[PDB]
């Protein structure tokens, strides 16, 4: 049915260190049992303009029905693109809990999304005690603004 | 019509060195002329728990109608996800024989799917005298269990 | 509706240094707000068989309706795969102008599509004053034929 969920927002819609300090643009498109994801995060305010830490994480938790729970992402921006309705009950976009069991250690590695200077990215699925989750991690360069390159990722969905 | 073929199995469904020594989870999703593939292979028994060789291949051969022929993968696990019927006559999931002519040498390279330690992966299409095929190759670390990271790949399908 | 645009051609359909000196096979498939692209370019004549430069670009410009404008690609080969009609008015395949504003500097990096020897690839969206565009760039090895490995890329489309 509905193919696309995204978090597009012209204004800040993500809170990492303080309220609305970042823009998060995550887009998920479903093609059968696969979702193709792209994620772009832009640091806009505070330490995100001059990093102290050398890594940053973002967790998006969902209930067992596929609803986004309170987290760093402004929920009002998490919408079905086609209808512009909030992305409620998106079970068939959730990472498959048989393929990615809750709290299973992910294969020990990550992805280079840039070189010179190097930036790494990883996504871990269902690191959560109930429901579903995405946990994203990026490297960061201390003293510099946080704005990693876009990352692409693919996973198997719940049926 | 049908969008997804996969080989999901809770039990071993692949025979590399001996009967049912591995689990193979290959998932193909069709979006027009492209298929998006993910493949995860887990070594479970025998030398797959303590490798001798430093590379391993898996060939999936198909007839000219898109039916899986006898091979290392348990055919009863190769199913259309949506209907849970065996994946018979999947011609429009086959690697395009104009784009990938039978027995054409593939571009001389491969993909790093892990570093520290390094693991490489490649897929070659239609290395077969009749019909269609996928030939997958992974590096392996001697003395260690075989369980490479998941690989993602994309190809153009038959019409 | 229509899912696939491609430039498949048995004969040369691209003009880099001289008329019809290359074959370009670009395939775009739309899955909601994402397009999955693959691109393969083969140098066939002239300096493309023995390169002088160490990099080569290809720009595909489109009007505001999603029609291909005069460029290096033979327009008669740019077709909807499903109908075999020319790919006219393909607005919903165009790179989103909110996500990729015209003439916005792209994240400063590129992709390795081969090692030993190394080959890099990049795609920049909407580097154009009106309408839409793709600008592709590959490295090349002086003294050798131009035939880089296939590249895969994903972008967000216009609505």
Swiss-Prot record, chains A, B, C:
* Cysteines paired by S-S bonds: none
Name of the protein in question: Fiber protein 2
Q: Which domain of life is it from?
A: Viruses
What more is known?
All late proteins expressed from the major late promoter are produced by alternative splicing and alternative polyadenylation of the same gene giving rise to non-overlapping ORFs. A leader sequence is present in the N-terminus of all these mRNAs and is recognized by the viral shutoff protein to provide expression although conventional translation via ribosome scanning from the cap has been shut off in the host cell.
Note what the entry says on domains. The tail region anchors the fiber to penton base capsomers, whereas the shaft, built from several repeated motifs, allows the knob to protrude from the virion.
Similarity field: Belongs to the adenoviridae fiber family.
Q: How does it assemble?
A: Homotrimer. Interacts with host receptor CXCAR. Interacts (via N-terminal tail region) with pentons.
Covered part of the full sequence, start to end and full length, is 229 to 387 of 387
What task does this protein carry out?
Answer: Forms spikes that protrude from each vertex of the icosahedral capsid. Interacts with host receptor CXCAR to provide virion initial attachment to target cell. Fiber proteins are shed during virus entry, when virus is still at the cell surface.
What induces this one?
Answer: Expressed in the late phase of the viral replicative cycle.
Provide the species name: Human adenovirus F serotype 41
